[PDB]
Design a protein around this ligand. Structure first.
Ligand SMILES: O=c1ccn([C@@H]2O[C@H](COP(=O)(O)OP(=O)(O)O)[C@@H](O)[C@H]2O)c(=O)[nH]1
Ligand SMILES: [Mg+2]
Ligand SMILES: [Mg+2]
Length: 238
């Protein structure tokens, strides 16, 4: 496949079907979809199940259980790394169990990277609808090329060439950072590693959507966005 879509899933039974469906109906259909379920409850697994009949889906379920295991690593980062090691696509993109892809998302992102060989990481705009009908609508824009993506660009808004993962692993020893000190902002930490070598190029269109309507006590102290943004400003790549 041209594209490997890596989705992480953990106990969001009321949302995961809409997420998975949004990927499976894309107008660009030449992808493999990894569904990396982190040993979810029965209800979640029962919602996911019918989608496994789609021949593009690559379903992997962890054996993880209990607070020690759930807090030893940033779990979604661990599952993404496992899927990266199995991916066959030239382009890599990420999805979650409560985020929806707009219908031409893969088409538009594949076209941008196909047309601009000099761009290695692209990002689109994203929209979040707050429900209470809609009480509020937020948009995270994609207006400029940026060497400082952490906490400005979401997990679900990017696509990058597979070759980006090589540089990152060479410097840092892994792709995403499994350290549990980056549990809350794992996407920012991976973008932080990418920003050591590449800027993020914008695609100014809203191509992903979010709807908002003992574990915590065992994680270590969470590192924050300001720390990541200040280290990239100090690194001065742009
Ligand atoms: O034990 C867990 C908890 C969460 N996640 C996944 O990590 C991703 C990001 O997490 P979450 O949605 O909880 O965070 P937020 O949207 O608040 O950044 C999602 O795809 C979850 O399915 C996971 O694999 N294992
Ligand atoms: Mg969420
Ligand atoms: Mg987040």
């Amino acid at each position: 496949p041209k594209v490997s879509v890596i989705m992480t899933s953990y106990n969001k039974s009321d949302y995961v079907a809409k997420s998975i469906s949004s990927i499976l109906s894309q107008t660009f259909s030449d992808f493999e979809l990894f569904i990396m379920d982190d040993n979810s409850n029965e209800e979640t697994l029962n919602v996911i199940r019918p989608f496994l009949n789609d021949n593009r889906v690559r379903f992997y379920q962890s054996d993880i259980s209990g607070v020690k295991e759930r807090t030893e690593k940033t779990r979604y980062a661990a599952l993404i790394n496992q899927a990266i090691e199995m991916a066959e696509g030239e382009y890599i993109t990420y999805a979650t169990d409560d985020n929806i892809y707009m219908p031409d998302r893969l088409l538009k992102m594949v076209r941008e990277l196909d047309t601009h060989p000099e761009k290695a990481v692209i990002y689109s705009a994203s929209k979040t609808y707050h429900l209470n009908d809609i009480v509020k609508e937020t948009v995270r824009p994609a207006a400029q090329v940026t060497w400082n993506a952490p906490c400005a660009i979401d997990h679900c808004s990017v696509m990058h060439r597979y070759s980006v993962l090589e540089k990152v692993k060479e410097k840092f020893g892994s792709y995403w950072d499994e350290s549990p000190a980056f549990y809350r902002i794992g996407d920012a930490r991976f973008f932080w590693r990418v920003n050591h070598f590449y800027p993020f190029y914008p695609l100014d269109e809203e191509l992903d959507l979010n709807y908002i309507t003992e574990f915590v006590r065992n994680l270590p102290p969470q590192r924050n966005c300001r720390e990541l943004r200040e280290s990239l400003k100090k690194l001065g790549m742009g």
